[PDB]
């Protein structure tokens, strides 16, 4: 389970 | 299970 | 589980 | 599982 | 995993 | 697990 959020 | 977001 | 989040 | 952004 | 930004 | 980031 990986969650990878990017801004 | 694997979530990504990019922006 | 892994969580990474970048701003 | 590789991410890489350039500006 | 691996994870690069550049500016 | 690595994380760069440049600016």
Same mark, same amino acid.
């Given at each position: %389970? *990986? =969650? =990878? *959020? %990017?801004?």
């Amino acid at each position: %389970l *990986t =969650i =990878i *959020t %990017l801004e």
